[PDB]
Amino acid sequence: ILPVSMTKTSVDCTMYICGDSTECSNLLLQYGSFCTQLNRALTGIAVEQ
C-alpha cells in the first residue's frame, strides 16, 4: 500500500482570521501581503496533488 495524494484543502485568510469584519480586516492589511503568500502556498500544494 502506498499513498499518492492528500485532500486538497484551500483556506481563506480574512475569513479565518476575521470573518465578516471590516475593522479586523483593515487592521490585518497592515501586516502586509502575508495571506497572499499563505493562499499561494496552499494553492501550490493543491495543484501538486
Partner: protein, 49 residues
C-alpha cells in the same frame, strides 16, 4: 479592478496579460439584511436610585 472578474484577476495577479488557466480570486458572501434584535420582555427599572 472592479469592472469584471477578468479584470479582478488582472488586479489580483498584478499583471495585464494572464495566461491560460484557472484563478482563485476572492471570497464572496451573501450580504446580511433585516438586522433583528431580541431581548427579554421585561420592563421593570433597575433600582439605581
Amino acid at each position: 479592478c472592479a469592472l469584471d472578474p477578468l479584470s479582478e484577476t488582472k488586479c489580483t495577479l498584478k499583471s495585464f496579460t494572464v495566461e491560460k488557466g484557472i484563478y482563485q480570486t476572492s471570497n464572496f458572501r451573501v450580504q446580511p439584511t433585516e438586522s433583528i434584535v431580541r431581548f427579554p420582555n421585561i420592563t421593570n427599572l433597575c433600582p439605581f436610585g
